[PDB]
């Protein structure tokens with residue numbers, strides 16, 4: 001077992017540090033169970049790409065261990081199609097060193113990569129969804145047969161450690177009660193069946209069922225715009241330019257949102273999904289939820305991000321293709 005300390009940036013971004021190359025080129029990265037690739041901006045990334053001007057660039061010509069590949073990797077992020085090329089090098093993750101192939105982004109839109117406090121993504125997803133079919137970092141750690149267990153866990157603190165990922169297990173110090181596991185529907189994705197979503201006292205959503213992407217990478221909880229337009233209106237959520245809000249002084253009265261997974265009800269009190277910046281009546285306060293129309297095969301599917309994870313310590317169990325959730329502590 002190895003644990004990676006995470007920095008919690010305004011409850012929207014939880015990222016850690018990986019070292020890449022010889023010598024180790026440090027990168028602040030989000031460990032994303034929603035993606036299966038390692039992406040870091042390339043030193044080859046044109047200075048024109050703003051996301052690159054203000055971010056740690058990986059310089060291959062600075063690493064003695066670098067193993068060129070060149071294979072161009074691409075992925076459209078409904079904001080722009082980012083592109084880089086495949087590269088190989090030793091990546092250190094919480095004391096664990098692994099030869100890992102990753103993408104160096106050479107081209108990527110400002111939004112939202114420009115606002116990232118971190119420089120890259122450590123895809124924790126499955127290889128089934130790894131662009132270029134590149135073997136994921138954790139699959140690469142598993143291969144080492146050093147981890148005490150084929151699982152990694154997430155602890156996203158409620159700001160102020162900012163968070164904590166445990167490679168190989170889970171930290172009892174960060175959850176309480178017991179893990180209630182939901183199985184992974186389609187294998188190859190950290191997604192589980194969801195028996196509806198409730199609003200205070202009314203199962204008026206996801207009725208009949210729906211899918212939930214347990215995305216450690218997503219800042220918020222999301223679902224099809226339909227579900228969110230429904231949900232947000234049912235809360236009194238008055239939509240803004242993008243995210244929905246609600247008068248601060250009225251955030252504490254908003255009803256409890258619950259997600260049904262594994263025969264257990266996962267409730268988010270209003271203090272769980274509202275960014276209670278203040279309690280004034282004049283200022284508006286945002287909700288840790290938004291509409292994310294995720295495209296198939298995985299989508300449409302709700303996505304339980306940091307908002308969800310913050311309250312429920314999460315465990316991604318590979319060996320058993322299931323996800324554990326326990327009261328984050």
Ligand SMILES: COc1ccccc1COCCCOc1ccc(N2C(=O)CNC[C@H]2COc2ccc3c(c2)NCCC3)cc1
Nearest residue numbers: 032034035039041082105112113115116119120121217218
């Ligand atoms: C980390 O993104 C970068 C930032 C600067 C420079 C280079 C990169 C990576 O290259 C870009 C190529 C790969 O880019 C992505 C990789 C993974 C994703 N995700 C998924 O596929 C599924 N779920 C969640 C996300 C991870 O969470 C994210 C990603 C970006 C942001 C936030 C959260 N939060 C706020 C700041 C931006 C999105 C984009």
